[PDB]
């Protein structure tokens, strides 16, 4: 497949320069990579500058990945393993010489880099937000009344999942404490005890609510049985009276 | 390439394999780790991420994807966008766990271009964490037993409430098909009184 993005366009190219420079400046690139950046510098790229920009721009994707010698081969491997779709239009020798005419594509490649970073952050916090949900929303599920067996089963499953998550967090804290040549599980034990106390309080509140609901349901069942007996008697009497009145009216008319 | 010193010692492959099979896993066979490949290694990342803290990958991937995978905009590159997001967030969550267990050199090439040495070091970290977690579970099984007892009590209470509701919903009548109440009884009494008055008037007329 061909390249649909108009990299050869001029006003588009200037716009790409614009937001690329804005993003690069807003992350304090000039200080962290100790390399000054200018619109003119991006207009006329160089081997060292392009390599440094690509290195910084990828390290935002995978901070744990370290670079080494043979920069061109590493860039090609990175581009391959990023599931890049337009790679059949790129070549290793072109990567080795960024500044040529082929640069009219290469800078736009960096653009997609930046875009992923932007997309990355919409994902990033949400992962923590997911855990945040497990911190709060499930608790709300434990604080709501139950009207069906499926709801009770879901609440029990949520409580079990919360207990498992608390145990996993305590184990992780204990492992972190034990990593630094020490055996200090006291903070982990305190956290586990606090989590167990919170779970016990939630379970007790749920049990009290269920018991109150059951008592109310039993009282309503007794009242409903009495009312049903009374209503059946009243309905039988009303039907008999209506039949008698209809018969009397038919006889008199 | 990033590299750090590890607190855990280097461990050889065979009892690693057998203990990984014994503890929770079944795909951690001898030949599977003996031959490093992308698919098996990323799948193993999946089983472990569902193992130690117990929430599925697909839920997290969808719950991080929905904002770009839906119809905010029509641009075609959305599918490659989301695929890159998938691989990067898998890298990122695996990096969280591996820096949580003392590995600060792990990366994305570990996911997709694995090699024996780093994979076996990661597996040694995995087994040490699994053994420590097993010890913690053995020490804190009292909390698990208490939680199980609480769940059983809650299930019993829910069953009692359901039985009470079923008993309550067992009352019905022609007047009061929505379970008997005071309003239906009052309406029936009023109708019966009117019919009785009419019948008494007719009887007096025909007396």
């Amino acid at each position: 497949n061909r390249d649909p993005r108009p990299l050869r366009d001029k006003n588009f190219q200037s716009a790409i320069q614009e937001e690329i420079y804005d993003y690069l400046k807003k992350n304090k690139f000039d200080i962290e990579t100790n390399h000054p950046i200018s619109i003119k510098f991006l207009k006329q790229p160089t081997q060292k500058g392009f390599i440094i920009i690509f290195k910084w721009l990828y390290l935002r994707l995978d901070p744990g990945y370290g670079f080494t010698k043979s920069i061109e081969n590493e860039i090609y491997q990175i581009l391959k393993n990023l599931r890049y779709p337009f790679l059949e239009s790129i070549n290793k020798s072109q990567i080795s010489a960024v500044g040529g005419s082929n640069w009219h594509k290469f800078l736009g490649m960096l653009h997609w880099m930046v875009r992923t970073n932007i997309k990355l952050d919409m994902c990033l916090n949400k992962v923590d937000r997911s855990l945040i949900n497990q911190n709060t929303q499930e608790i709300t599920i434990l604080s709501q009344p139950l009207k069906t067996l499926d709801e009770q089963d879901q609440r029990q499953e949520r409580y079990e999942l919360m207990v498992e998550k608390l145990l996993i967090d305590y184990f992780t804290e204990s492992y972190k404490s034990f990593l630094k040549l020490e055996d200090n599980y006291e903070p982990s034990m305190q956290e586990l005890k606090l989590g167990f106390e919170k779970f016990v309080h939630i379970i007790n509140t749920d049990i009290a609510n269920l018991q109150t609901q059951n008592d109310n349901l039993y009282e309503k069942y007794q009242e409903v049985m009495k009312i049903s007996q009374k209503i059946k008697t009243t309905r039988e009497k009303w039907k008999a009276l209506k039949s008698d009145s209809n018969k009397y009216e038919n006889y008199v008319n | 390439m990033s590299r750090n010193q590890d607190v855990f010692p280097i461990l050889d492959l065979q009892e690693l394999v057998i203990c990984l099979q014994s503890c929770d896993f079944a795909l951690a066979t001898q030949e599977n780790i003996s031959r490093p490949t992308s698919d098996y290694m990323v799948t193993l990342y999946k089983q472990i991420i569902e193992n130690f803290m117990g929430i599925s990958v697909e839920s997290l991937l969808n719950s991080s994807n929905q904002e770009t995978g839906d119809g905010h905009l029509q641009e075609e590159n959305e599918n490659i966008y989301l695929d890159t997001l998938n691989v990067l967030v898998l890298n990122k969550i695996c990096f969280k766990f591996f820096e949580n267990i003392g590995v600060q050199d792990f990366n994305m090439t570990d996911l997709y271009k694995p090699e024996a040495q780093r994979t076996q070091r990661l597996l040694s970290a995995v087994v040490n964490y699994a053994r420590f977690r097993e010890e913690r579970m053995f020490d804190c099984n009292s909390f698990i037993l208490q939680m199980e007892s609480l769940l059983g009590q809650l299930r019993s209470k829910f069953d009692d409430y359901n039985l009470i509701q079923q008993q309550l919903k067992q009352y019905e009548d022609v007047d009061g098909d929505n379970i008997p109440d005071e309003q239906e009884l009052q309406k029936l009494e009023e109708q019966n009184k009117e019919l009785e008055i009419q019948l008494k008037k007719l009887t007096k007329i025909q007396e």
Partner: peptide, 29 residues
Amino acid sequence: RRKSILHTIRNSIAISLGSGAARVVNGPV
């Protein structure tokens, strides 16, 4: 998967030819 980790651990309890973890300072610090 409905296999609870806590329930599975309790069932197993009620090292698999191994040891209760280890911690040794690496020589090549």
